Amino acid sequence: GSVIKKRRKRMSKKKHRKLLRRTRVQRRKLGK
Amino acid sequence: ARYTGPATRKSRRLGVDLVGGDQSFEKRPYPPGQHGRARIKESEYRQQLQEKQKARFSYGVMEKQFRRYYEEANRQPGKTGDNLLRILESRLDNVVYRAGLARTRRMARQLVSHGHFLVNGVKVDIPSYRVSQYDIIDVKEKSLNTLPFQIARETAGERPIPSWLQVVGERQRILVHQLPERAQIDVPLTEQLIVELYSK
Amino acid sequence: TMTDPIADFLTRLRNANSAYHDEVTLPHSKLKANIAEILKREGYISDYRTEDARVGKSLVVQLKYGPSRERSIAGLRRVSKPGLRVYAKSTNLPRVLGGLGVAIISTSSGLLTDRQAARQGVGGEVLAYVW
Amino acid sequence: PTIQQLVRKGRRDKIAKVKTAALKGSPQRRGVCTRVYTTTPKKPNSALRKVARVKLTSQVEVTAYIPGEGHNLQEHSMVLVRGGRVKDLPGVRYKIIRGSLDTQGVKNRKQARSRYGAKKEK
Amino acid sequence: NYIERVVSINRVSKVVKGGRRFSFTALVIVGDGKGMVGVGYGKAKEVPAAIAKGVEEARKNFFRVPLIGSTITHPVQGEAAAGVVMLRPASPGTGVIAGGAARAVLECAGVHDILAKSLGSDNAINVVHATVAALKLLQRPEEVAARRGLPIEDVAPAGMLKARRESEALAAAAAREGSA
RNA sequence: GGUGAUGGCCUACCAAGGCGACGACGGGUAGCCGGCCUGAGAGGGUGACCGGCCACACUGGGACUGAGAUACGGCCCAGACUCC
RNA sequence: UGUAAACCUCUUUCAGCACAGACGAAGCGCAAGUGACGGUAUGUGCAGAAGAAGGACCGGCCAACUACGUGCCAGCAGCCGCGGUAAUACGUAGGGUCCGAGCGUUGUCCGGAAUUACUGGGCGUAAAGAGCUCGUAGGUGGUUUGUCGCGUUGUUCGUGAAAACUCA
RNA sequence: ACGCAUUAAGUACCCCGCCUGGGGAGUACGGCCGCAAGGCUAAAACUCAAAGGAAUUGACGGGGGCCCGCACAAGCGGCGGAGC
């Protein structure tokens, strides 16, 4: 169908993975 | 309760003249209000509601009671419409009206409620009394000589009598052969749109 | 794989009746033959032959159409499927098409319509509706 | 799906969202107006819509509309809160009803007096 | 005396260089009130002309409805584009009870007693087409028995034939006051 | 042994089994039903009156008496609360 | 507005005033009486319309429409949304409508919702085929003979308390 | 609807997986796997009255094709600079 539906998920995923790359070491110090 | 307001205007809103004797509607045709002669959107709901209200205000029955009558008709067998009409005609105000003792269902209601009648010996102050097969509706001893029943016996040739009913005495005793069928009812109304209404 | 030759038979019938075929050959089963007999008696088909194949036996249903190719059948519907077997008591038998149809019922009195089953006071497995 | 899929997993109706949770099953609640104020509605509408943050008896602080022309409400006022959606105000689902022992009726209502706590004058 | 019944009026908009160029669509059912009914969809710049075109299309594509009395022969579920309308016959006096589209087509056909229900695609046009498809799927017992190659008795139920004979009497014997 | 009575109900010993994806063990919620409300029905929701069963009687535990006891308006203990 | 009203006539239900006055009790008592309800219900008479009607709604769903005032304010609204000086959507008047000693609102449940679809849905693009296979449990099972009669079906018995629901 | 159309998206049967408005979010918490990256399972609050699918008519395109116009190109004369 349309690619807007792809683009919404795209932006969500992009921002989430940026957040993870940003909090990688914090998340490690907390989890591990 | 009951509707003690003007009578002609309901008939005017509903087109059919239930009693008659006015010139406003009868020269200019319109429902009541300043916005008579207005533009109408011709909805089936208005049709149905108008037949229901025709019945309600032709008789003296209110909606919370007419609903019960409808439900009785729908439960009990046969056609719901003619069962409902049979019920509405098999009540004391209506039988004495149809017998011509009052020439108005309002007047018949006042008479029964004031106790100018009785049924099989026992006094009845209930217009909603559902009469039955083989019912003698006597008038009491004060009432037969009172003026309204004098007027009844005097002018008991104006409107016809149903078949299921007959008056038998100069004292205006009334007898019920059976309960009326849709041919016996003789009312200016259908009966299908009302059941459609309450099936909505 | 194949899981109900009854539905296979009804489908061969339905598809051939849609395509206006005059014959329907299919494998044989005593149950399918009895069903075909019911359809013949109720007038939904012209005839049915039981013949021999290379290996076993075949049913050849000679279907029926009017003069203007009016389909003698308007529908077939398996009901007691594998996975969901439906059984009818003699009281709550189904009226197919308001009664103008025919429900095939398997009972210990044999294979017989809903009408016959209500007559005989019995019920059983509802195989098909064949209006 | 298949019948066996159903007997295994079954049908689960979508969970209806509990609404007016601040009432906690009640039709109304009593609450102190913690902050009476005014809010601006959504974009198509514009007005100064009267509201109050009320701390109910359910231990919940909610926003509540104040229908009618006038209102005498200050903080610390005992108020009776019903339900009712106000579309233009996004974050509000409750209304205040007159005859709350503080919220007197609206002045000079004469058509729909029951909905605004107005007594008949005769 | 053809009874006519509009169910829906809709302002449709073509778009052009200048702007929105409007027109009107009228869905008009018409019938004889006794079993013949037709549907029309009139498209025209003005509402009355649209209705007139709908009337003409309906009277062109009339079709006859099987009945046993003032109801239908058997239940039937008609499907359209996406309109799904079940029809179920009903005992007399219960009244045609249906949404305005199915209701209109049935009241124009003369079906005063019937159960009907739209199960998909609330759009009135496809609903009407679905209802019509149902009425076309209907099968009178006479033509059914012909289709089978049997009597009417052993294909149709005694209740249907009882009501059939009753309606036939109330038609013919009660047409005396009309014929004389 | 115990019970009115069968039974790990309890005990000594013996054997090592038993339950679990067909959801054990846990967590949450809840008295159950006839019925009630809705609904075309299937179903959904509910468990007010009325009627039946259960459970409880400040909390927890315990027995005694007795044909019969969760013994509300009985007993013992402990605890909280109130009072002399 | 509005046969509405005024005015003529009638009627007295109900309420009020006076008198009587229970059934409930083949009961209890072998004592002479015994009814809490109760001097109640109810019957008799008495006077006169005499003491007795509000509430919601009127843009569509949803019958029922105008005027005035306010014009993105005040406000309304369940959704669509209405108010940006000519508002049938706000407020008030009239008028109409729906009910009627009720009327509306809120809350809760079902319906409508075939919107968890057994009856009764679907999955190419609308949400929906696991990335594909193997295979366990499970589900399912070609033709045919016989048997069991578990399912199934028929019949009968018992039970399915009463009340409820339904029919009379 | 586009389209599928004996390689079905048809007619039917069996079995499995999956959906139940859009966002939030295939995210958090928990757990499992993994060296890690991250994956798998998988919400809620809150929020919107839509999100969406196909197709139609137009408009538009730093899409295409064909054709026009002092539109460009080829020329002539100017304005913009001075004064009025």
Tab-separated table of C-alpha atoms in Angstrom, chain B residues 51-181:
chain	number	residue	atom	x	y	z
B	51	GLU	CA	-50.650	6.747	14.170
B	52	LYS	CA	-49.555	5.880	17.699
B	53	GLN	CA	-50.582	9.320	18.920
B	54	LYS	CA	-53.811	9.124	16.923
B	55	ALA	CA	-54.685	6.065	18.958
B	56	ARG	CA	-53.471	7.575	22.239
B	57	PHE	CA	-55.508	10.760	21.976
B	58	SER	CA	-58.533	9.227	20.282
B	59	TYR	CA	-58.735	7.111	23.392
B	60	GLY	CA	-57.554	8.488	26.732
B	61	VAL	CA	-54.486	6.305	27.058
B	62	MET	CA	-50.965	7.452	27.866
B	63	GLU	CA	-47.780	5.989	26.466
B	64	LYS	CA	-46.662	3.976	29.490
B	65	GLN	CA	-50.011	2.128	29.217
B	66	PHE	CA	-50.238	1.931	25.444
B	67	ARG	CA	-46.836	0.251	25.557
B	68	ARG	CA	-48.305	-2.422	27.814
B	69	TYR	CA	-51.226	-2.850	25.442
B	70	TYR	CA	-48.816	-3.274	22.543
B	71	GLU	CA	-46.832	-5.830	24.497
B	72	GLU	CA	-49.953	-7.806	25.375
B	73	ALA	CA	-50.920	-7.827	21.713
B	74	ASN	CA	-47.459	-8.897	20.582
B	75	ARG	CA	-47.305	-11.750	23.088
B	76	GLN	CA	-50.817	-13.026	22.534
B	77	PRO	CA	-51.491	-14.699	19.208
B	78	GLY	CA	-52.849	-13.342	15.979
B	79	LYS	CA	-52.019	-10.016	14.442
B	80	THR	CA	-50.516	-7.608	16.954
B	81	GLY	CA	-52.329	-4.674	15.397
B	82	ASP	CA	-55.876	-5.956	15.557
B	83	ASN	CA	-55.217	-7.449	18.983
B	84	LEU	CA	-54.144	-3.986	20.112
B	85	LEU	CA	-57.251	-2.416	18.626
B	86	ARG	CA	-59.372	-5.104	20.255
B	87	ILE	CA	-57.792	-4.185	23.581
B	88	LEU	CA	-58.248	-0.450	23.106
B	89	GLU	CA	-61.868	-0.965	22.105
B	90	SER	CA	-62.504	-3.465	24.906
B	91	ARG	CA	-62.279	-0.859	27.627
B	92	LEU	CA	-65.100	0.781	29.457
B	93	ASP	CA	-64.750	4.356	28.232
B	94	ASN	CA	-64.684	3.121	24.664
B	95	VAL	CA	-67.576	0.680	24.922
B	96	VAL	CA	-69.893	3.261	26.431
B	97	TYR	CA	-68.751	5.811	23.851
B	98	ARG	CA	-69.408	3.347	21.032
B	99	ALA	CA	-72.767	2.657	22.660
B	100	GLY	CA	-73.427	6.377	22.386
B	101	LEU	CA	-74.061	7.229	26.021
B	102	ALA	CA	-71.438	10.001	25.973
B	103	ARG	CA	-70.600	10.868	22.315
B	104	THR	CA	-66.992	11.593	23.410
B	105	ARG	CA	-64.383	9.305	24.897
B	106	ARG	CA	-63.424	12.085	27.315
B	107	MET	CA	-67.001	12.186	28.569
B	108	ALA	CA	-67.133	8.412	28.812
B	109	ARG	CA	-63.927	8.485	30.839
B	110	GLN	CA	-65.367	11.051	33.223
B	111	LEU	CA	-68.516	8.975	33.606
B	112	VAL	CA	-66.770	5.691	34.363
B	113	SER	CA	-64.239	7.339	36.661
B	114	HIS	CA	-67.008	9.132	38.544
B	115	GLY	CA	-68.806	5.824	38.899
B	116	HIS	CA	-71.928	6.301	36.802
B	117	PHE	CA	-71.577	2.701	35.654
B	118	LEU	CA	-70.995	-0.784	36.940
B	119	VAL	CA	-70.241	-4.207	35.526
B	120	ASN	CA	-71.903	-7.449	36.588
B	121	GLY	CA	-73.007	-5.888	39.878
B	122	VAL	CA	-69.785	-4.337	41.163
B	123	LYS	CA	-69.035	-0.650	40.798
B	124	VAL	CA	-66.251	0.292	38.397
B	125	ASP	CA	-64.248	3.521	38.646
B	126	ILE	CA	-61.671	2.336	36.106
B	127	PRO	CA	-61.840	3.490	32.461
B	128	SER	CA	-59.074	1.013	31.693
B	129	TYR	CA	-61.310	-1.850	32.822
B	130	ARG	CA	-60.855	-4.492	30.169
B	131	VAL	CA	-64.356	-5.772	29.542
B	132	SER	CA	-64.800	-9.323	28.340
B	133	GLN	CA	-67.143	-11.668	26.551
B	134	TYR	CA	-70.614	-11.715	28.103
B	135	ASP	CA	-70.380	-8.548	30.190
B	136	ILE	CA	-73.446	-6.700	31.442
B	137	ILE	CA	-72.597	-3.037	31.946
B	138	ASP	CA	-75.380	-1.574	34.054
B	139	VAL	CA	-75.891	2.034	35.025
B	140	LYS	CA	-76.610	2.850	38.640
B	141	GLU	CA	-79.857	4.215	39.994
B	142	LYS	CA	-78.892	7.860	40.385
B	143	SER	CA	-77.145	7.855	37.044
B	144	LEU	CA	-80.067	6.597	34.968
B	145	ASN	CA	-82.136	9.639	35.966
B	146	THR	CA	-79.213	12.062	35.872
B	147	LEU	CA	-79.023	14.445	32.943
B	148	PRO	CA	-76.154	12.865	30.933
B	149	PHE	CA	-77.969	9.552	30.641
B	150	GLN	CA	-81.206	11.356	29.860
B	151	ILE	CA	-79.261	12.937	27.007
B	152	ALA	CA	-77.962	9.503	26.031
B	153	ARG	CA	-81.381	7.858	25.813
B	154	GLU	CA	-82.703	10.971	24.061
B	155	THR	CA	-79.988	11.153	21.387
B	156	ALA	CA	-79.295	7.423	21.036
B	157	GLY	CA	-79.754	7.503	17.276
B	158	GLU	CA	-76.890	9.720	16.130
B	159	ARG	CA	-73.879	7.419	15.806
B	160	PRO	CA	-74.206	3.688	15.024
B	161	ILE	CA	-73.509	0.813	17.406
B	162	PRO	CA	-70.862	-1.873	16.828
B	163	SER	CA	-71.970	-5.438	16.255
B	164	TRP	CA	-70.097	-6.974	19.206
B	165	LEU	CA	-72.047	-4.544	21.434
B	166	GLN	CA	-75.712	-3.857	21.879
B	167	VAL	CA	-77.848	-1.772	24.182
B	168	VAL	CA	-80.829	-3.730	25.470
B	169	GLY	CA	-82.861	-1.471	27.754
B	170	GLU	CA	-84.341	1.994	27.966
B	171	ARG	CA	-82.268	2.077	31.155
B	172	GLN	CA	-79.347	1.722	28.702
B	173	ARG	CA	-77.978	-1.597	29.880
B	174	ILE	CA	-75.188	-2.712	27.563
B	175	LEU	CA	-74.251	-6.211	26.451
B	176	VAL	CA	-71.114	-7.648	24.882
B	177	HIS	CA	-71.495	-10.534	22.465
B	178	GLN	CA	-67.762	-10.982	21.872
B	179	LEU	CA	-64.670	-8.878	21.416
B	180	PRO	CA	-64.282	-6.950	18.174
B	181	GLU	CA	-62.453	-7.978	15.052
